């Protein structure tokens, strides 16, 4: 909500109370996960060619007892320009250049954006370090088309599996449509930290990404879909994953009245693991959907199906999840 | 302050800074006990009888070090609807029920609430995990009856004095006057988790409380009083007390400049402890007063003045404590 | 931005993305360091003649993974009242007597303010449990004539380094101008705290510093200089300084266009020290500049020059940084 329009600035002060239940058995937990966001973000006009920017993205722990004040965590922080025609530059906590791609299938009521996208895993999902020049139409008119090259700096503070060394990511996206069309591909070679490297699992020199998506979003309804394929980039209980193929794919349709249903199905498939072979990451079909009162107030049911087996020789977790719940938001 | 009123969305942005010190020995210890207070809330209106609602307060640490950043903690997230005339349905980290009855009394400059009521101890005081609807004046005509029917789901990440199975509670409330009367009471059966029964005190199967409250709120004075009793829900040194009786009373006037006393008691008084037989828990006169520049600015003094003995078995606390302080809030 | 200025209360929201990054090696590290800040503040006007207030100022970290919630930290919470003519009274974490002085040069795109003042080191940065009065041009006419009497309640929870005993801290300050001139100097005698004196180094009674400033802000240029000393307050690998003395300087000019370039240096001397001798606490030059695209967009670069040795008794850190940001702030 704008609260603020007034001698060339304007801020925006947003924010969603997601009480929010999952039943189910201890896969990713169950009971409350609610939480509530709370973000600024600001416009200043310079000239009426150019234009700042700041945006900030907490997120504040609902289901904890008091006594743990383990509670807030921010998701993004950044602060940039973006001149009338050229685009924009922006730095600090921001998304990587691959989820330019793989947004197209995240959008279930809860679960997803679970396969390639790690948050805090060099660029794939949100992460820190990020300088990134978008461009956009292409500054001479190829109207569509869509450019993003980005720098991410090394991050090597934090736990093994968090860490990056100095990297790299472009995407572009085209669009057209008598109604709505777009295909979009991204590119990602970050190299690994070296205290990575003494690690059992997908041990190496660089960290490379690439993903592909097809959307379409028209006369209410939505289909999207994307591959992609990590060369030591996502995290495994032995180590880093030597190679992996995820595939998303995505089906809604909203109807007048306020009901959205969504199918979508996920699957993240590790590869060449070294000493485990190849069993799946992640498996599972969603169902679900969510009843927009309107713009403010909703309420949903998601039921993640694992479709994942059990003799899973990573040793990860079968069981269903049924999360549901009314989402406040301003 | 309602900093937003626009298109069917109220957005009151709220908050206070409680610069305050104790002066004391080391009970609830002494020394700065400062904090600040942030929380919004929308009511999004979907139609001409349904509303729709989110609220967050968080509490940030004004006493610690920046370098102690264990300094936030959120006390109310939910979200929910409440339908003209059928009353209000909610989820998120809330009051319980038995709070409807010891708020009554839980109105000094400072001390109190301090009975039966502990802090995410199962529906007690505030609490995670509660599904909650309250009907009002009753559906038809009962003007001044209040009803409050709510769920706990189980907590057991958590601490084992803060964990919780699932459980219910109820409370009513039926209002009066000529100037102003109300009698209340609640209930609450939610069975103890597992883990908390590798205990040394209060080992058992459920957890039962229940409570009783009177008051007078009128032309100007406000008294009220509340008896209460738990079975095995009040953490003790040993582990949970085996039941338990409280008691609070609360006098104060209002004078019209602006001060305002407050005289009250606290009594909490174990029974039947697992080793230790029966030593009170809490036993203190409060005397006290704020001074109410106006809405916003405010100032006071209090003082608890324990009544526990030195020879308690239980090792508690018998000193006493002078908070003084001022309020601003928005 | 004062988002709320109705019924005699004025609310004011800030805050601001420093998206930033720090080239260099590790002596106060490299990479990312972005930070948001937050703030409120209120005024309520009580009558024509008082008014109150409550400042809040968070400091939410930017660069983390978003695992490490180990994130926010408070840097002021207080809330008082003001006196036409009489003065103002506050209480709460605030800031110390002394850097009503050493703010002078602390003005630099991102190092300095480093010497004497480090934060939660008694009154000498920022600093909690402070009761404040600040009288303004005497309370008839001396006009220019500023003054602060402060009382820091004891800090004994905290870290041995970050502790303190009670104490009081005066500082004043009389401007001129045709253009714009000040002189400045203040005053701290805190006792330490005994568990403190189980210590290595700088074990005492008593822990005072003092300051003196000169400055001369006008028709752009801006420049400011302070000598400081300390006796068993400034922190050291060993254990606090016996005594030192600390020297700041600042040249700044602020061109039409909206460059502000800035000199400065900062040398902190250890003294006596019990068991190195004398090594310098602090030595290097800062060469730097902010461009301000407008009141709330703008970017840096700053320059650490380290002037330190290699050899360093203490074993502190000779190598320069480099920082790089734009800040947006609303």
Same mark, same amino acid.
């Given at each position: 909500?704008?609260?603020?329009?007034?001698?060339?600035?304007?801020?925006?002060?947003?924010?969603?109370?997601?009480?929010?239940?999952?039943?189910?058995?201890?896969?990713?937990?169950?009971?409350?996960?609610?939480?509530?966001?709370?973000?600024?973000?600001?416009?200043?006009?310079?000239?009426?060619?150019?234009?700042?920017?700041?945006?900030?993205?907490?997120?504040?722990?609902?289901?904890?007892?008091?006594? !743990?004040?383990?509670?807030?965590?921010?998701?993004?922080?950044?602060?940039?320009?973006?001149?009338? !025609?050229?685009?924009?530059?922006?730095?600090?906590?921001?998304?990587?250049?691959?989820? !330019?791609?793989?947004?197209?299938?995240?959008?279930?009521?809860?679960?997803?954006?679970?396969?390639?996208?790690?948050?805090?895993?060099?660029? *794939?999902?949100?992460?820190?370090?990020?300088?990134?020049?978008?461009?956009?139409?292409? $500054?001479?008119?190829?109207?569509?088309?869509?450019? *993003?090259?980005?720098?991410?700096?090394?991050?090597?503070?934090?736990?093994?599996?968090?860490?990056?060394?100095?990297? $790299?990511?472009?995407?572009?996206?085209?669009?057209?449509?008598?109604?709505?069309?777009?295909?979009?591909?991204?590119?990602?070679?970050?190299?690994?930290?070296?205290?990575?490297?003494?690690?059992?699992?997908?041990?190496?020199?660089?960290?490379?990404?690439?993903?592909?998506?097809?959307?379409?979003?028209?006369?209410?309804?939505?289909?999207?879909? $994307?591959?992609?394929? *990590?060369?030591?980039?996502?995290?495994?209980?032995?180590?880093?994953?030597?190679?992996?193929?995820?595939?998303?794919?995505?089906?809604?349709?909203?109807?007048?009245?306020?009901?959205?249903?969504?199918?979508?199905?996920?699957?993240?498939?590790?590869?060449?693991?070294?000493?485990?072979?190849?069993?799946?990451?992640?498996?599972?079909? !969603?169902?679900?959907?969510?009843?927009?009162?309107?713009?403010?107030?909703?309420?949903?049911?998601?039921?993640?199906?694992?479709?994942?087996?059990?003799?899973?020789?990573?040793?990860?977790?079968?069981?269903?999840?049924?999360?549901?719940?009314?989402?406040?938001? $301003?």
């Amino acid at each position: 909500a704008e609260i603020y329009n007034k001698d060339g600035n304007k801020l925006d002060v947003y924010g969603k109370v997601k009480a929010m239940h999952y039943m189910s058995d201890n896969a990713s937990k169950d009971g409350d996960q609610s939480y509530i966001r709370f973000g600024f973000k600001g416009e200043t006009q310079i000239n009426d060619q150019l234009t700042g920017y700041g945006r900030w993205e907490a997120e504040f722990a609902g289901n904890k007892a008091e006594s !743990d004040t383990a509670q807030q965590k921010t998701r993004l922080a950044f602060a940039g320009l973006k001149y009338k !025609d050229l685009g924009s530059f922006d730095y600090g906590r921001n998304l990587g250049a691959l989820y !330019d791609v793989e947004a197209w299938t995240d959008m279930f009521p809860e679960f997803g954006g679970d396969s390639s996208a790690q948050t805090d895993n060099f660029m *794939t999902k949100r992460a820190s370090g990020l300088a990134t020049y978008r461009n956009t139409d292409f $500054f001479g008119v190829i109207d569509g088309l869509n450019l *993003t090259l980005q720098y991410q700096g090394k991050n090597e503070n934090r736990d093994v599996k968090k860490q990056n060394g100095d990297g $790299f990511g472009t995407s572009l996206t085209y669009d057209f449509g008598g109604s709505d069309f777009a295909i979009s591909g991204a590119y990602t070679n970050s190299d690994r930290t070296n205290e990575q490297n003494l690690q059992s699992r997908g041990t190496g020199k660089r960290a490379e990404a690439w993903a592909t998506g097809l959307k379409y979003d028209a006369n209410n309804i939505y289909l999207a879909t $994307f591959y992609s394929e *990590t060369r030591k980039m996502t995290p495994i209980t032995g180590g880093f994953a030597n190679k992996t193929q995820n595939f998303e794919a995505v089906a809604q349709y909203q109807f007048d009245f306020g009901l959205r249903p969504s199918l979508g199905y996920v699957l993240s498939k590790g590869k060449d693991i070294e000493g485990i072979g190849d069993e799946d990451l992640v498996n599972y079909i !969603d169902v679900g959907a969510t009843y927009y009162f309107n713009k403010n107030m909703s309420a949903f049911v998601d039921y993640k199906i694992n479709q994942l087996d059990s003799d899973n020789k990573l040793n990860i977790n079968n069981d269903d999840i049924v999360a549901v719940g009314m989402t406040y938001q $301003f």
